[PDB]
Amino acid sequence: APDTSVSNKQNFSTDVIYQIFTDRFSDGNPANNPTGAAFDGTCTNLRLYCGGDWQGIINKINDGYLTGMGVTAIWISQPVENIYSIINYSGVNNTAYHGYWARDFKKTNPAYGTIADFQNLIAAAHAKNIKVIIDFAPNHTSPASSDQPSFAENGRLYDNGTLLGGYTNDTQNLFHHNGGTDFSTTENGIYKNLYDLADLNHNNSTVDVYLKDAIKMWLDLGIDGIRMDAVKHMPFGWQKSFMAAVNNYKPVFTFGEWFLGVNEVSPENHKFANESGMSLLDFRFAQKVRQVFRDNTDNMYGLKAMLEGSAADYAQVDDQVTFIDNHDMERFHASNANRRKLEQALAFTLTSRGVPAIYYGTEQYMSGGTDPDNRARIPSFSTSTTAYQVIQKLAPLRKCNPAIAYGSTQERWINNDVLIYERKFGSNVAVVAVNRNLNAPASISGLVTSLPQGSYNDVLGGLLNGNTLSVGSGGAASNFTLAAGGTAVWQYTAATATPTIGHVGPMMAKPGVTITIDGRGFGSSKGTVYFGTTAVSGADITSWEDTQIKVKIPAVAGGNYNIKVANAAGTASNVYDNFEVLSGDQVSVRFVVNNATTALGQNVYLTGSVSELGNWDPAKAIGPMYNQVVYQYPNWYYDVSVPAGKTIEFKFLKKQGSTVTWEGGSNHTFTAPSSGTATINVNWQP
Ligand SMILES: OC[C@H]1O[C@H](O[C@H]2[C@H](O)[C@@H](O)[C@@H](O[C@H]3[C@H](O)[C@@H](O)[C@@H](O[C@H]4[C@H](O)[C@@H](O)[C@@H](O)O[C@@H]4CO)O[C@@H]3CO)O[C@@H]2CO)[C@H](O)[C@@H](O)[C@@H]1O
Ligand SMILES: OC[C@H]1O[C@H](O[C@H]2[C@H](O)[C@@H](O)[C@@H](O)O[C@@H]2CO)[C@H](O)[C@@H](O)[C@@H]1O
Ligand SMILES: OC[C@H]1O[C@H](O[C@H]2[C@H](O)[C@@H](O)[C@@H](O)O[C@@H]2CO)[C@H](O)[C@@H](O)[C@@H]1O
Ligand SMILES: [Ca+2]
Ligand SMILES: [Ca+2]
């Protein structure tokens, strides 16, 4: 099936996500509405239940509200069973309408619907070529207090009705007991409570395995994607082990939430996206897009810098989920502002690299402050709005223009208020022009594109004051005027003859697993897939076609491989890099090293006899290690994803820049658990 098919649970670059706050969408079944001080059918008290449900979603998917827009994917609130208790935060009643207060990951939220309802949601959606993504919060349970076990539900965690444990009198040690985080450091925000939410301890085999079993359930229920919540609050190593659990069973596009603020650029965030095995929500993109189009605290030059930079920082920039606003920030549209800003940002997002995601109600010009004002009920299902139309015209492009989906980005013209960029993939091209300046037109001369000779009509049909473009020879465009607040989209598509790889997923897995390779010019006959120098052909290639290839991962050694393909004729494609071949099934292990003294600016890393440990390469060593919460300096620790049941030789090192200092004596040894977790305590050898 084409790379565009709804069945492609491995690629979302051609889709348009629609983020839905289930409760605030549509009440298709009032019989499941909560009651009492937890319910409010008017939806004035934004901290209560409003009635929104899966049934409602189905109806909207059925009357054409979503399909009409061009939406091809929906991200819904956490489906699992949340607490029932109505919490009181200073005279104000709060409920788990949001779904981020997990009680039992093996059951659904009655308010949203039954398992049967969820199954109906999947079918209705699938039938309408719409993919389903679900929010998942394995970082915690609910708001708790060890002192007052009467507070809410003591963060109680169940396993399909069976009570595992609570926050108070936590003998099993399921949760963390290190206080709350101040967001001071990564390690601080990972091992301490996020707010007052009962932090789960992933180092406990019970929790580990449990969450592993849970996710399978949902996977078996037909989901198409996963949205990992609070990923910067969970151990990277564990997450890696969790991802492999997914990829080694039922691969699905996964992206986590790594909150970033204005002008914030984290390297820890980059490395996560590149090694974790999952992608992330483009906060970088979102924040900059806001300064530029919203608050006007930066200009086009800042927009260009972001694009270029990101493309260099992320190994797979096209896997990043872009957005302009969400349930955690003020709605992009201000009650007094010009709507043209919101439309512009929308156009920009839809035609940019990554995976566009739209927070429900945007198309309706919903204004609102922070939580919970940004979570109002969808006021209307009108397709007459300008925003609704923009989405409607541009959305489909991601499907018919590989340039938009997998294309590169290039500034072709720029200035303080104007930005013209070129998306390009194979014989496909897209050129977009934006003029934020709402009061001044811009004269565009010297514009050069990759557009074939001829005239081009604005894809937006002048909806946003766009215009016609005249491209002479050499891609040189004729002089034109870019109206105030103008936005134009010109394009050119053609059949690609050369094999061009645009996507690959999953991005991490063990031998035997089937991976998906999408692109153009693959031909109709089976060819060859190269995993490094290892060639693959024949039966192992489950399926081959012009835009997609399904091939089983060869039994090569664990490590990082380069993926290339060649058609029947023998013509080779571009080289897709950064694919990780796991050594086998994964298990999360905690490494601890005692008496490891360092100098200010010098850190301790780990290395070993397996690819998951860098293979003895100081440049690929795990770290830097932690030393301040679970263990204090000179005692370091770290949660690492290693191959289960394997015998590993390891060592630690102190790294100062590129300068490496090896541990002395012989190599440490240990045999990884064939399931669940373990802790390795060792002393530094001099
Ligand atoms: O060549 C292939 C070999 O691969 C495997 O060797 C591993 C070792 O088992 C690891 O210990 C590590 O080697 C480090 C080593 O930890 C460290 O001691 C250091 O050795 C220094 C030594 O301290 C110092 O006295 C002096 O002699 O210089 C040495 C450095 O050359 O440095 C090693 C890294 O250079 O990694 C290697 C692989 O690189 C495998 O076990 C072997 O069987 C195999 O030969
Ligand atoms: O002509 C090629 C040239 O085009 C663009 O330059 C624009 C520039 O962005 C405008 O601000 C203004 O100065 O007119 C120029 C037209 O020459 C590209 O920015 C540039 O890379 C490229 O060389
Ligand atoms: O907390 C992380 C921190 O660890 C190391 O700092 C050590 C330092 O090396 C010791 O000499 C002593 O001062 O304790 C510190 C731990 O608080 C790294 O050197 C440093 O880069 C890193 O921030
Ligand atoms: Ca309902
Ligand atoms: Ca945590």
Q: Which of 207, 178, 208 is nearest to 194 (CA)?
A: 178
Q: Which of 413, 437, 444, 450 should be mutated for ligand 2, with most atoms under 8 A from CB?
A: 413
Q: Whose CA is nearest to atom 7 of ligand 3?
A: 600
Atom of ligand 3 nearest to the CA of 602: 19
Confirm or deny that 156 is annotated as ligand binding. no
**What is the C-alpha separation between 337 and 325, in angstroms, rounded?**
16
Contact in structure between 685 and 665 (CB atoms under 8 Å):
yes
- Domain 1-400 identical in fold to domain 496-582: no
Q: Which of 584, 563, 585 is nearest to 574 (CA)?
A: 563
Centre of ligand 4 to C-alpha 113, Å, is 8
CA distances from 373 to 44, 214, 423 (A): 10, 32, 36
Contact in structure between 172 and 187 (CB atoms under 8 Å):
no
Q: Whose CA is nearest to atom 4 of ligand 1?
A: 616
Confirm or deny that 375 is annotated as ligand binding. yes
- As a three-state string, the secondary structure of 36-103 is HHHECCCCCCCCCECCCCHHHHHHHHHCCHHHHHCCCEEEECCCEEECCCCEECCCCEECHHHCCCEE
Q: Which of 611, 616, 647 should be mutated for ligand 1, with most atoms under 8 A from CB?
A: 616
**What is the C-alpha separation between 168 and 647, in angstroms, rounded?**
38
Estimate to the nearest angstrom the gap between the alpha carbon of 594 and the chain centroid: 36
Resolution in A: 2.5
Tell me the CB-side half-sphere exposure of residue 217, using CA atoms within 13 A.
Answer: 18
How was this one solved?
Answer: X-ray
Contact in structure between 142 and 103 (CB atoms under 8 Å):
yes
Contact in structure between 142 and 195 (CB atoms under 8 Å):
no
Question: Which amino acid is located at 303 in the chain?
Answer: L
Confirm or deny that 546 is annotated as ligand binding. no
Centre of ligand 3 to C-alpha 577, Å, is 35
Q: Which residues line ligand 3 (CB under 6 A)?
A: 598-603, 627-628, 633
**What is the C-alpha separation between 394 and 492, in angstroms, rounded?**
14
Q: Which residue has the tokens 């999360």?
A: 588
Q: What angle do CA 100, 101, 104 make, to 5 degrees?
A: 115
496-582 fold: Immunoglobulin-like (2.60.40)
Atom of ligand 3 nearest to the CA of 603: 18
Q: What is the DSSP letter of 200?
A: B
Strands 355-359 and 411-414: unpaired
Tell me the CB-side half-sphere exposure of residue 104, using CA atoms within 13 A.
Answer: 14
Ligand with minimal distance to 667 CA: 1
Tell me the CB-side half-sphere exposure of residue 192, using CA atoms within 13 A.
Answer: 15
Q: Whose CA is nearest to atom 15 of ligand 3?
A: 600
For CA atoms 402, 408, 411, 416, the dihedral sign is: positive
The tokens of 127 are what?
A: 């039938």
Atom of ligand 1 nearest to the CA of 651: 16
**What is the C-alpha separation between 455 and 360, in angstroms, rounded?**
36
Q: Which residue has the tokens 């090896």?
A: 662
Centre of ligand 5 to C-alpha 553, Å, is 33
Confirm or deny that 32 is annotated as ligand binding. yes
Q: Which residues line ligand 1 (CB under 6 A)?
A: 616, 651, 662, 667
Confirm or deny that 678 is annotated as ligand binding. no
Q: Which CATH superfamily is domain 583-685 in?
A: Immunoglobulins (2.60.40.10)
DSSP labels, 116-171: HHHHHHHHHHHHTT-EEEEEE--SEEEE--SS-TTSTTTT-EEETTEEEE-STT-S
Cβ within 8 Å of residue 426, ≥6 positions away: 402, 403, 496, 498, 500, 520, 521
The pair phi, psi for residue 207, each rounded to 5°, is: -70, -45
CATH placement of domain 1-400: 3.20.20.80
Ligand with minimal distance to 625 CA: 3
Ligand with minimal distance to 664 CA: 1
Cβ within 8 Å of residue 254, ≥6 positions away: 225, 226, 227, 228, 243, 246, 277, 278, 279
The pair phi, psi for residue 19, each rounded to 5°, is: -75, 120
> Domain coordinates of the chain in residue numbers?
1-400, 401-495, 496-582, 583-685
Question: Which amino acid is located at 508 in the chain?
Answer: M
**What is the C-alpha separation between 61 and 38, in angstroms, rounded?**
27
Centre of ligand 3 to C-alpha 656, Å, is 12
Strands 632-643 and 626-628: antiparallel
Atom of ligand 3 nearest to the CA of 627: 1
**SS3 assignment, position 296:** coil
**What is the C-alpha separation between 55 and 60, in angstroms, rounded?**
9
Centre of ligand 2 to C-alpha 303, Å, is 16
Centre of ligand 2 to C-alpha 445, Å, is 8
Q: Which of 662, 667, 684 should be mutated for ligand 1, with most atoms under 8 A from CB?
A: 662
Q: Which CATH superfamily is domain 401-495 in?
A: Golgi alpha-mannosidase II (2.60.40.1180)
How many residues does the structure list for the chain?
Answer: 686
The tokens of 627 are what?
A: 């030393």
Atom of ligand 3 nearest to the CA of 633: 16
